[PDB]
Amino acid sequence: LGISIMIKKPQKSKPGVFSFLDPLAYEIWMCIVFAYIGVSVVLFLVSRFSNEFGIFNSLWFSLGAFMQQGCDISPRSLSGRIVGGVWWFFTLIIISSYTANLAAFLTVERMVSPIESAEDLAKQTEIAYGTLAAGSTKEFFRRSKIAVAAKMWAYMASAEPSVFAATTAAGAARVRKAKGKAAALLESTMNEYIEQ
Amino acid sequence: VVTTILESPYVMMKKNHEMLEGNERYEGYCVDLAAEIAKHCGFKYKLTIVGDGKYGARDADTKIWNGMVGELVYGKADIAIAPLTITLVREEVIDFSKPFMSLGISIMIKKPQKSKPGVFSFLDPLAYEIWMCIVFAYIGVSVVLFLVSRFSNEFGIFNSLWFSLGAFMRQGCDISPRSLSGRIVGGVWWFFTLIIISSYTANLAAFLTVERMVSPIESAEDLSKQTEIAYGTLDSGSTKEFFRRSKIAVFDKMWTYMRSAEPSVFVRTTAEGVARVRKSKGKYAYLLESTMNEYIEQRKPCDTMKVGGNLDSKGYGIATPKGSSLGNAVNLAVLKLNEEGLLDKLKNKWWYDKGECGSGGGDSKEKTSALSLSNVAGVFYILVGGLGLAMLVALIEFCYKSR
Amino acid sequence: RKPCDTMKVGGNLDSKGYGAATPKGSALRAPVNLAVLKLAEQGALDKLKAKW
Amino acid sequence: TAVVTTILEDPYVMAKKNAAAAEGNAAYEGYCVALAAEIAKHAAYAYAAAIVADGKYGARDAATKAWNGMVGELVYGAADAAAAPLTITLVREEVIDFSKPFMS
Ligand SMILES: O=c1[nH]c2cc(C(F)(F)F)c(N3CCOCC3)cc2n(CP(=O)(O)O)c1=O
Ligand SMILES: O=c1[nH]c2cc(C(F)(F)F)c(N3CCOCC3)cc2n(CP(=O)(O)O)c1=O
Ligand SMILES: CCCCCCCCCCCCCC
């Protein structure tokens, strides 16, 4: 056996039902609706000074224009064409932005690398790791003359909270409650008994 | 009878110094250096802190030394294993070792973090020149399509501009050209708009995926050239008096700037200077000793960093009074310690191994967040502006038609 | 001072130093040490390096 | 007078164009010749720059403790100053007496 890592088991992390709309915040998703109503009413207003752009027809055109599809009708006056052009530019930017940020989400999530060895845990500093208070594992690290091992010991010697655990039952509990923050360093056989 | 100083990384008191104080208790870089000198030169030294708490300087009228020079010229102490900026007046009164560490006047700036995304940021993925070329390409294609359709179909200027704008924004075109020369223009503009929109989307995805942070200032020459960021020293000291007695082109500018500038850039103490750099987001740059800067950027909260090389080089020695038989027993020890790779090992350990933060871990720190309204609102403003303008021109046309 | 196909990146790893050496136990030891220290204080060694 | 010992070919000491036209120390000038002009005015001596012959900095040969080149020209009393880039080393220090670094 040997000294072995122990980390919280990664959960399945089921995605939300409406997770497709994460790449844009909730404020954006509602100001889109409110700007759509505003545009559909202004286009009616401008067309109706005194054709086909009633209010229902105008809401249909503006919906079509947001979804990049576009309808059979199109404004045929200068002051309706201005509204059309500006709403077109806005929807182009918003849709391009949604796709770009979704690609960013997927790309970043794909390059995820869990802490797999001791070297990776040594370089990384986001997760605190703690041995038992008094035992052969702590004395190992104190007497350790390996740079990576000494790097951990230098870290474990001083920490704002006590990374050390008094009891191995406490050590298991600390990792479970820390939700990935605590990484116990116990013997391999006990580790394989606990995870099983 | 070795002296020392209270500087935190160099000679420090352990936790509960009251419980344990003295030779076997004191810690610090100079402490371990003294121990290694003993290992190379066995001697009976008792560690005594400097009484005055500061380094040497001779009052003009008094003409007496004090601190680590007063404790050595007057036989009050044996040597001084501590940071002495070796210099002319101190060397005329003490015998100095070969410099066991070299340094300079570093530049200290706050670590650059991502700014608040300003409005009109949606047009960052493409350079300004490309946006201008897009505008004038649209206005050139529309007029050419008009001319073509009016050599040999309606496609007047007002309707051709609408067709081109519709084709760019990927929204379906109302009408399509029927001639051949009217169709070549349509095909070319379709290809162009497809490539441009694909480029914008792809580059924006690159912007959001991996982020690069650039230091606003790189070196002291560019810092003098910029002058948008205010840079200040300590009030009075070597790092301050250097700029007055400097005749290099850049340094005279960097002095005559801070010589006459409001408010007071000069800081009372280094703690206040680092606090001011941390407070002001990017407007303050601090010019301190290189070692102090390197040490500070390692401590919590690790919110600062050192940029640029050292402006002028100095050295720290191990002072020893002129007549001492220990005078030549320290030069050789220092040179051997330097050559063995032991002094560098010491500095490395006590500055990076005792590091509150590490650069080699979490350097990427990759995290992606939902795109807030702040990023986008620059297009909501344009949308509402366009609507207001449309209503305005509608009333203008109405009032014109009515008369 | 050579065609810029190469560049220096990163800080130097170790430390060294050049000194205007004098023969052991000679009469030009102290004045030369003073001359070098005073030159470095006034930047006459930084004006020269920036030149060549 | 005093005799100086400089190494060559570097950025430090170079031979001027029309070296044959010029004579004495002026026949070759460089950074460490300009330096070894300033030190004169603070130690007040008139020298004549003399390039080392062997063209090596110096090390005691393993077989025979003979110091070569620029430090050798000092140890054996052949010439006095060493106004040239001699790295400050322990082995050279135990034999010869340096100054404080003029460059790091
Ligand atoms: O011999 C000197 N050695 C010095 C060593 C240090 C440091 F190394 F940092 F400990 C400092 N500090 C600079 C800022 O950080 C805290 C104190 C000042 C020194 N001064 C005073 P100066 O003349 O103003 O440089 C000397 O005189
Ligand atoms: O005292 C010394 N002075 C030296 C001066 C120089 C330089 F001035 F830069 F020429 C150099 N070079 C840098 C590397 O490329 C070749 C020349 C080395 C030196 N060495 C080490 P070595 O001569 O390589 O054994 C010394 O020990
Ligand atoms: C469909 C036409 C839309 C026109 C949008 C014009 C954008 C103007 C933004 C200028 C900001 C310049 C900041 C330096």
GROMACS .gro file of N, CA and C in nm, chain A residues 80-155:
model
  228
   80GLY      N    1  -4.022   5.338  -4.169
   80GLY     CA    2  -4.041   5.201  -4.126
   80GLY      C    3  -3.915   5.123  -4.156
   81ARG      N    4  -3.844   5.164  -4.260
   81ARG     CA    5  -3.720   5.096  -4.294
   81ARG      C    6  -3.611   5.126  -4.192
   82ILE      N    7  -3.615   5.242  -4.127
   82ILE     CA    8  -3.519   5.269  -4.020
   82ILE      C    9  -3.540   5.173  -3.903
   83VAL      N   10  -3.666   5.155  -3.862
   83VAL     CA   11  -3.696   5.061  -3.754
   83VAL      C   12  -3.654   4.920  -3.793
   84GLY      N   13  -3.685   4.880  -3.916
   84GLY     CA   14  -3.644   4.748  -3.962
   84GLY      C   15  -3.494   4.730  -3.956
   85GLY      N   16  -3.419   4.828  -4.006
   85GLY     CA   17  -3.275   4.814  -4.009
   85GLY      C   18  -3.214   4.806  -3.871
   86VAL      N   19  -3.263   4.887  -3.778
   86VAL     CA   20  -3.205   4.888  -3.644
   86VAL      C   21  -3.239   4.760  -3.569
   87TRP      N   22  -3.363   4.712  -3.580
   87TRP     CA   23  -3.398   4.585  -3.517
   87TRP      C   24  -3.320   4.469  -3.579
   88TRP      N   25  -3.294   4.475  -3.710
   88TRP     CA   26  -3.211   4.374  -3.774
   88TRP      C   27  -3.070   4.372  -3.717
   89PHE      N   28  -3.008   4.489  -3.704
   89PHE     CA   29  -2.873   4.494  -3.650
   89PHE      C   30  -2.870   4.442  -3.507
   90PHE      N   31  -2.967   4.482  -3.426
   90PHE     CA   32  -2.972   4.435  -3.288
   90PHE      C   33  -2.984   4.283  -3.282
   91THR      N   34  -3.074   4.225  -3.361
   91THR     CA   35  -3.089   4.080  -3.354
   91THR      C   36  -2.967   4.008  -3.408
   92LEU      N   37  -2.898   4.066  -3.506
   92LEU     CA   38  -2.775   4.004  -3.554
   92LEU      C   39  -2.672   3.997  -3.443
   93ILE      N   40  -2.653   4.108  -3.372
   93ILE     CA   41  -2.555   4.109  -3.264
   93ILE      C   42  -2.594   4.011  -3.154
   94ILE      N   43  -2.722   4.007  -3.118
   94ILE     CA   44  -2.762   3.920  -3.007
   94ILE      C   45  -2.745   3.773  -3.043
   95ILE      N   46  -2.782   3.734  -3.165
   95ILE     CA   47  -2.770   3.593  -3.201
   95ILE      C   48  -2.624   3.552  -3.216
   96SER      N   49  -2.543   3.638  -3.277
   96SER     CA   50  -2.400   3.609  -3.285
   96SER      C   51  -2.340   3.596  -3.146
   97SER      N   52  -2.382   3.682  -3.054
   97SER     CA   53  -2.333   3.677  -2.917
   97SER      C   54  -2.375   3.549  -2.846
   98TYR      N   55  -2.500   3.507  -2.864
   98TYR     CA   56  -2.545   3.383  -2.802
   98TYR      C   57  -2.461   3.265  -2.849
   99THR      N   58  -2.443   3.253  -2.980
   99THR     CA   59  -2.365   3.140  -3.031
   99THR      C   60  -2.221   3.145  -2.982
  100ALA      N   61  -2.159   3.263  -2.984
  100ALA     CA   62  -2.020   3.273  -2.939
  100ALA      C   63  -2.006   3.234  -2.793
  101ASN      N   64  -2.094   3.283  -2.706
  101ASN     CA   65  -2.080   3.250  -2.565
  101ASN      C   66  -2.114   3.105  -2.537
  102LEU      N   67  -2.207   3.046  -2.612
  102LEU     CA   68  -2.232   2.904  -2.596
  102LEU      C   69  -2.109   2.822  -2.634
  103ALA      N   70  -2.042   2.861  -2.742
  103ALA     CA   71  -1.919   2.793  -2.778
  103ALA      C   72  -1.815   2.808  -2.670
  104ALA      N   73  -1.808   2.925  -2.607
  104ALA     CA   74  -1.714   2.943  -2.497
  104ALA      C   75  -1.745   2.849  -2.381
  105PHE      N   76  -1.873   2.839  -2.343
  105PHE     CA   77  -1.911   2.745  -2.238
  105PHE      C   78  -1.864   2.604  -2.271
  106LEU      N   79  -1.899   2.556  -2.390
  106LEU     CA   80  -1.870   2.417  -2.422
  106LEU      C   81  -1.720   2.392  -2.430
  107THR      N   82  -1.646   2.483  -2.492
  107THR     CA   83  -1.502   2.466  -2.503
  107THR      C   84  -1.436   2.461  -2.366
  108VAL      N   85  -1.471   2.555  -2.278
  108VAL     CA   86  -1.406   2.557  -2.148
  108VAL      C   87  -1.443   2.434  -2.068
  109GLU      N   88  -1.570   2.393  -2.070
  109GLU     CA   89  -1.608   2.274  -1.995
  109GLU      C   90  -1.536   2.151  -2.048
  110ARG      N   91  -1.503   2.150  -2.177
  110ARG     CA   92  -1.438   2.033  -2.235
  110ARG      C   93  -1.295   2.018  -2.186
  111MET      N   94  -1.223   2.129  -2.170
  111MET     CA   95  -1.088   2.125  -2.115
  111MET      C   96  -1.092   2.137  -1.962
  112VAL      N   97  -1.150   2.036  -1.900
  112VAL     CA   98  -1.148   2.021  -1.755
  112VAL      C   99  -1.061   1.901  -1.722
  113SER      N  100  -0.970   1.919  -1.627
  113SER     CA  101  -0.875   1.814  -1.590
  113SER      C  102  -0.879   1.799  -1.439
  114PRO      N  103  -0.933   1.690  -1.386
  114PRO     CA  104  -0.939   1.673  -1.241
  114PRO      C  105  -0.801   1.643  -1.185
  115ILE      N  106  -0.788   1.668  -1.055
  115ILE     CA  107  -0.662   1.643  -0.984
  115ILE      C  108  -0.641   1.492  -0.979
  116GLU      N  109  -0.545   1.442  -1.057
  116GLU     CA  110  -0.529   1.299  -1.073
  116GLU      C  111  -0.406   1.244  -1.002
  117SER      N  112  -0.297   1.319  -0.995
  117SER     CA  113  -0.176   1.273  -0.927
  117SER      C  114  -0.141   1.367  -0.813
  118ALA      N  115  -0.029   1.338  -0.747
  118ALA     CA  116   0.018   1.425  -0.640
  118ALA      C  117   0.081   1.552  -0.695
  119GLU      N  118   0.149   1.544  -0.809
  119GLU     CA  119   0.211   1.663  -0.866
  119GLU      C  120   0.106   1.767  -0.902
  120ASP      N  121  -0.004   1.724  -0.963
  120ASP     CA  122  -0.111   1.817  -1.000
  120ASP      C  123  -0.169   1.884  -0.876
  121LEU      N  124  -0.188   1.808  -0.769
  121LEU     CA  125  -0.239   1.866  -0.646
  121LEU      C  126  -0.137   1.959  -0.583
  122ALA      N  127  -0.008   1.932  -0.604
  122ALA     CA  128   0.095   2.019  -0.548
  122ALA      C  129   0.098   2.154  -0.619
  123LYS      N  130   0.097   2.153  -0.752
  123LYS     CA  131   0.099   2.278  -0.827
  123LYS      C  132  -0.026   2.360  -0.799
  124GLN      N  133  -0.143   2.297  -0.812
  124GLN     CA  134  -0.268   2.366  -0.787
  124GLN      C  135  -0.279   2.404  -0.640
  125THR      N  136  -0.340   2.520  -0.614
  125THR     CA  137  -0.352   2.570  -0.478
  125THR      C  138  -0.495   2.596  -0.434
  126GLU      N  139  -0.594   2.569  -0.519
  126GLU     CA  140  -0.733   2.597  -0.483
  126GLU      C  141  -0.787   2.501  -0.378
  127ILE      N  142  -0.733   2.379  -0.371
  127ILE     CA  143  -0.784   2.275  -0.283
  127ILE      C  144  -0.685   2.255  -0.170
  128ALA      N  145  -0.734   2.256  -0.047
  128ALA     CA  146  -0.652   2.231   0.070
  128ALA      C  147  -0.653   2.083   0.104
  129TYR      N  148  -0.536   2.030   0.138
  129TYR     CA  149  -0.519   1.890   0.170
  129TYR      C  150  -0.459   1.874   0.309
  130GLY      N  151  -0.513   1.781   0.386
  130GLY     CA  152  -0.470   1.765   0.524
  130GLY      C  153  -0.454   1.623   0.572
  131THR      N  154  -0.341   1.593   0.634
  131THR     CA  155  -0.315   1.461   0.689
  131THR      C  156  -0.377   1.450   0.828
  132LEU      N  157  -0.355   1.337   0.893
  132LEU     CA  158  -0.394   1.323   1.033
  132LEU      C  159  -0.301   1.405   1.122
  133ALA      N  160  -0.347   1.429   1.244
  133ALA     CA  161  -0.272   1.512   1.338
  133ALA      C  162  -0.135   1.451   1.367
  134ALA      N  163  -0.134   1.332   1.427
  134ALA     CA  164  -0.010   1.262   1.459
  134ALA      C  165  -0.017   1.121   1.401
  135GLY      N  166   0.081   1.087   1.318
  135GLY     CA  167   0.082   0.955   1.257
  135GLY      C  168   0.203   0.941   1.167
  136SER      N  169   0.213   0.824   1.105
  136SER     CA  170   0.324   0.798   1.014
  136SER      C  171   0.314   0.880   0.887
  137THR      N  172   0.194   0.927   0.852
  137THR     CA  173   0.179   1.006   0.730
  137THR      C  174   0.232   1.148   0.748
  138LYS      N  175   0.207   1.210   0.863
  138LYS     CA  176   0.259   1.345   0.886
  138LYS      C  177   0.410   1.342   0.905
  139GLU      N  178   0.459   1.246   0.984
  139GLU     CA  179   0.603   1.233   1.004
  139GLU      C  180   0.674   1.204   0.872
  140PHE      N  181   0.608   1.130   0.782
  140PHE     CA  182   0.662   1.114   0.648
  140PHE      C  183   0.687   1.248   0.582
  141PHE      N  184   0.587   1.336   0.586
  141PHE     CA  185   0.601   1.464   0.517
  141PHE      C  186   0.705   1.552   0.584
  142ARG      N  187   0.710   1.550   0.717
  142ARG     CA  188   0.812   1.628   0.787
  142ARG      C  189   0.952   1.579   0.752
  143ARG      N  190   0.972   1.448   0.748
  143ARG     CA  191   1.101   1.392   0.710
  143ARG      C  192   1.118   1.381   0.560
  144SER      N  193   1.015   1.413   0.482
  144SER     CA  194   1.025   1.405   0.337
  144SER      C  195   1.130   1.502   0.285
  145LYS      N  196   1.213   1.453   0.193
  145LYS     CA  197   1.318   1.532   0.132
  145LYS      C  198   1.299   1.539  -0.019
  146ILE      N  199   1.174   1.541  -0.063
  146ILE     CA  200   1.139   1.555  -0.204
  146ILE      C  201   1.074   1.690  -0.224
  147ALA      N  202   1.114   1.760  -0.330
  147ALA     CA  203   1.069   1.898  -0.350
  147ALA      C  204   0.917   1.906  -0.355
  148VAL      N  205   0.854   1.815  -0.429
  148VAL     CA  206   0.708   1.814  -0.435
  148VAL      C  207   0.649   1.781  -0.298
  149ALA      N  208   0.706   1.682  -0.229
  149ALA     CA  209   0.660   1.650  -0.094
  149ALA      C  210   0.687   1.766   0.001
  150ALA      N  211   0.805   1.828  -0.008
  150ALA     CA  212   0.835   1.943   0.076
  150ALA      C  213   0.743   2.059   0.045
  151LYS      N  214   0.704   2.075  -0.082
  151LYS     CA  215   0.611   2.181  -0.118
  151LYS      C  216   0.478   2.164  -0.046
  152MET      N  217   0.428   2.041  -0.040
  152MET     CA  218   0.306   2.015   0.035
  152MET      C  219   0.326   2.041   0.183
  153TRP      N  220   0.439   1.996   0.238
  153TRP     CA  221   0.463   2.014   0.380
  153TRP      C  222   0.474   2.162   0.415
  154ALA      N  223   0.539   2.240   0.329
  154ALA     CA  224   0.545   2.384   0.350
  154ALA      C  225   0.405   2.443   0.351
  155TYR      N  226   0.318   2.395   0.262
  155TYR     CA  227   0.179   2.438   0.263
  155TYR      C  228   0.105   2.388   0.387
   0.00000   0.00000   0.00000
